[PDB]
């Protein structure tokens, strides 16, 4: 979830 929802 660090680069997206």
């Amino acid at each position, epitope marked *: 979830a*660090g680069x997206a*929802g």
Partner: antibody
Amino acid sequence: QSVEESEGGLIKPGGILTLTCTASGFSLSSYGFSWVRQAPGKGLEHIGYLHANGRAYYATWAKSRSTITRNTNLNTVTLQLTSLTAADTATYFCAKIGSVSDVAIWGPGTLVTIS
Amino acid sequence: DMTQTPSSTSAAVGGTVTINCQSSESIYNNKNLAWYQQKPGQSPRRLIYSISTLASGVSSRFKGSGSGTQFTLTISDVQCDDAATYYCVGYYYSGGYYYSGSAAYYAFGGGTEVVVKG
């Protein structure tokens, strides 16, 4: 954990660059991986990002002549860059840049020379 | 995009260098921002991530700070070993739903050459 770009070298203008990023000790497909390049004596430049969710996002300059794809079966990601010119001479890196994650990993880079 | 200043700076051994980055849009989650050190012929070495978290094995005289669109790297008690080029890099992401589509990218700053005066 480590990654490794395939061999670069001398390439004719107008040709196609194909570079393979091979992973060891972990699964490439569980992380988003970018291709970054650096022209001789210039700064780092993002090409595109293959998100963990499988979508590829390209820098605007790269979108029309780049393709980034994953091979889960072989634990590779591949960069294809078409219509090369001298401006594409650079060191090319495979990297999880790690803007926020604990994990960050960079290949040693490979020199691609257009002449 | 990322505007990194100054592009060149110098400090005496024991001094302090400050490097700034300004992003035209806000970084993802107001968190996704790393700083890298690169010496000639080497891979970039990550110094800091999530704006202010020290990467493993990085000295505590490197300090990252900022928020939103403005970010700073401070090198305290600078040493000859700090002579290098430094880069900020932000991550950006928007959308992600069917009706929004999605877009993501990273933006590296132009870099800062740091000369250490011995």
